[PDB]
């Protein structure tokens, strides 16, 4: 029900007048409203209702995908899982080094969390039993202990510095690769292979 | 200038 | 351990948040890559309020950036300290509101706020003890006013006991960008008076006045305004991140500044702010800070305090000083101007002292005033709103989103009775 | 004599202690702003001379 | 953020020819089709190293269309885009709306269908046409009808050309103008008026070309539209999208008729004489002598204004100039609008094309406002339209083409009601 | 602080040509537009801003518009040396002359060009920030200056209001004159110059001719020398605004200290020393004698005798090597002379203005380079006898209705003739009653 005859087409209202001059004489007299702003609001309402009658149209019918070199072979390739990465997790630096971080901070950081503290102190260790072994088993523990004010009882476990055969730390260690002690440049020594 | 995949479509290096 | 969650809405909110986070990262000695590089230990203890440990000393701000146009995200990411924000926190729509409160509150907020609500819930429950939320937005835009308003309503629905700061800029007729500013501003104020705990009233007109007169700058772009707003947001919460001779959190300021629940529209300033040429002729003493505190020029509110009365006031001092000096300065400022302070509230001024000044500064201060002269901007907004709405101008863009004229009538009724009660208490 | 022994908040345009947190330095005030005007003028002169030719 | 432009008629496609030359020059796109992300709003990246415009040139005369096909930009335009008809409407709205329109509209529609499908973030359509001719007015009306019923919610900016109050190339143009402006009322979202006499005077006084052709007019129109879409094209201090105009320029859906202005329109010699600052270009953008349509805003009242800024512009100076203009009493705003301004700032100033006449300027202003002098333009056209229809002149041409006498009278009535709205809204 | 000057008529833009040449030579502006040297001496930087606006850079366009109906002299200006200095849009020129016809240039031809003059001067004022006021040049004997000038001043007054409009007009000399119908134009110009001009400075042509033949000893003086003297007067008038002095005076000083009533503003101009180059070397230059020579009727710029009248107020502009003490002594000396008298209305009828930069000299000119100079502007009652002397010979013509058919045909009538006659008579009565 539009107040203004503007919305209707030409021959539509022409046929209406040919059929019924009755509605044909309201759609002109519908503008009898004194306030033009009110009639404009009603026109806005009828236009809005007509727009609501119409349905929305999506603008993404044709999907467009960027291609690196426009070849199916290239696009369908997935890179092979080839990594020379170190197997130990402790070798990677997931946190700030414990050395520079403040002593009391390291102390209460241990107090809330022993585990990752033990891992940071023992970068080479990989199993839980190795990391939570002892503060006296690893010779490198003592600098950390007396830097962070952790008392170390004497003779723990033994006076002779040793007893970590699995983990390669200090002077007790050898790479599983064929040129043990490292530096393999030929096939004769192994070239860092098995 | 033309796209790469049409400039050398059948050009193949072989060693 | 008291936690503040930052929320940025719209282009203005995003830029203000970027400046605020840049300043905060400078205060705590955090590089643009996200790693600590400071000197003192006073910075490490209280960075959990704003930063989270990700990996390898990676400190990510506890902020949510949310808007509708990609230009703001591109600008935030391109500039410095754009690589410290977590990409998952960039919750973001695609179509845009375009200076339409109704679009940002009913048709575009309806499908976007769910992701924003999930992100903010994840961010809030990740920490132990929330201190409160903090939002920065505008009252003129579409994606900032309506969308931020709906977010405030929702997070009030979910967390009713937590405190909440709302740093909102109010458009002014003297400096007016768009045409539909009163239409958005009135509805935003009507919602904030019922949802927000306390509001920091900002205006670009007062910011331009400050930068032109007190700073005497040549090209005062939006960067200066965002710098001032960022400095204020840092200054309000200084006691949380640093020790002091008399601490004061957000809740203490709120309870000492709000005598009645609907009177939570405060007017703010910062000290010291002087031009490059006038820095040589000044000193750094408590009287020097307080005379600039109580000056109306330094006010970032477009309302002269002399035309009204001061209900309550607060001062946030920083640096090494003496408690007696601050106390006697406040006593003098209360005793001399005996007519500008309300009669039935003795000792209108709240004072607090923090020992750590902002980096590179000797002393600084912040002022939060709850005056009854705040209502005059609401009147000069209501006059324009009733000039428009009486002729139903531009209304078809709001009615078409489902919104009815009853919303506008209730908003005007609320704002009119708010200004009526502010006038009554004067 | 504390007022004698202290230094002003910021001295000179270049100062190592003036970071963004301290508001004694502002990016809005642009030094050598007049120098941009002369470059704009010479560029416009060249443009207009070429167009008129 | 992509927009597609369609052109109807000789004038529309010539304006498009200028517009696309300017667009290719501003983004550094060579005419062959490849450069030696801002271009995504106009050129879609097809294949690799190729850019094609998002436009269709449609016309009934094959002369101009295939002359463009064999001209400078042969490879720049996709061959299917340039739609060409077979017979002219011959300055007949009825002919191009019922006889020829029915077999040319379908091809344009299912081509624009795939053009829109290629896009993803379509902002809206914008139409270039002249109501004086038959092809632009006749089948342009049908195209607007079918686009409105097809999409509806999307914006359709209208840059039309009304006949001048005294300058005209035909006789039957009042009939075409009325029968086109009726369907222009409820199908386009924003209508920008462009009269040729105003541009002629602008070139005569400011650019001082004493023998200008349509090329300079098309170049000025291209500069205006480029400065208008630069906000979407480039990032600036304060950008506004294409959906901001309908938000802050049309208080009511039945009042969308924008006065066009541009500043600074200066020559290469005078640019060296006047200083170029934001204040003076903003002042010059409101004088009645710098309008693109012959109407005096002094007789009318401003309802809204849009300001586009390009180049060396910061918010401080534009805000100061807006305040000064607001305090000026030479121009008066309507009472129910206490703030009818909207400013947009972009960093890239307009570029210059070789062979052009505009000077390379650091800053420019594109002003678009809404007033009530459009009601004066409509009445001025209406008087001379009613002069012809009294004696039933040229009516037999339209009746034999398919329509009858009723359409003329009812279009006249709608024009009268539209007039009524223009005078009594400004009260 | 800025002042914009508008020049009306054929003689107006010739006076402007002299004035702007003098200004360009004085401020060191090369006629192509730019200043070769950025350094400044005396007044200091930003001194040129009151006459030249900083457009782009490397150019300084004057804040003036030459408006005229006959295109010949305007095109001569356009084609001469100063093409690049003046803007092409400021030299407003019509297409046909007003032909010594107040009616033609006031009702027929001026209507199509006054709007363009106004909408150019509007943006000229818009570019300004500290506009002191307007000041005009015209000759009331012509058609464009007299006819169009009245309409332009009326529209300026209605568009701006109380803004200062200094009027430097050129009256016909009682004996020596060039035109025939000029009494009509002069009277019809006075009827509006009474109520529109803020301060009017009279300038007769024969008085300057006598000054040139007597002092500068050019036995064949032309209009160029007269224009150069007018330019020197105007420069000595605006030097206080342009450059620094001991007692600087601006434009709104004159109306305050020289205009006792709003309808009494008519100033006799005087200048000293007007001396040749050879007379300059044997004659000493001190404040006393150059002040004494500024009150003698033999060196006045208007053919009238102030001894027959009473001085109401006087204004003294000093330039060059002048200090307050000796000018105070000189002005004290004047008050002792009983040959010239002051009306009892104002005992301290003096206002002094001291500047430091000496007046400049132009190559090809006839004035000598001197250490100091004086520009005198006074208000007395010889204007009353000047107006009545013109009135008599205007009333001679009107009794036989001569040349009246020209004016009526253009669109005016004969009633305004009578009202202008009555206005002049009322002005005579006002001056006589004030003289009491
Ligand atoms: N202080 C400040 N105000 C801004 C900034 N950006 C925009 N504004 C103001 O915000 C108003 C418009 O906000 P708008 O751009 O619509 O925000 P939106 O909702 O994100 O689109 C203008 O009047 C500006 O004055 C900003 O970075 N800082
Ligand atoms: Mg055509
Ligand atoms: Mg003359």
mmCIF file of C-alpha atoms and ligand atoms in Angstrom, chain F residues 9-11 68 70 97 100 142-145, ligand 3:
data_model
loop_
_atom_site.group_PDB
_atom_site.id
_atom_site.type_symbol
_atom_site.label_atom_id
_atom_site.label_comp_id
_atom_site.label_asym_id
_atom_site.label_seq_id
_atom_site.Cartn_x
_atom_site.Cartn_y
_atom_site.Cartn_z
ATOM 1 C CA UNK F 9 38.352 54.486 -13.312
ATOM 2 C CA UNK F 10 41.036 55.392 -15.817
ATOM 3 C CA UNK F 11 42.945 57.664 -13.421
ATOM 4 C CA UNK F 68 37.433 49.705 -15.259
ATOM 5 C CA UNK F 70 37.260 50.871 -21.009
ATOM 6 C CA UNK F 97 32.955 52.890 -21.458
ATOM 7 C CA UNK F 100 31.378 60.640 -18.618
ATOM 8 C CA UNK F 142 34.604 60.461 -15.112
ATOM 9 C CA UNK F 143 31.899 57.886 -15.658
ATOM 10 C CA UNK F 144 33.320 54.687 -14.190
ATOM 11 C CA UNK F 145 34.964 56.359 -11.197
HETATM 12 MG MG1 LIG G 3 36.675 57.289 -16.425
#
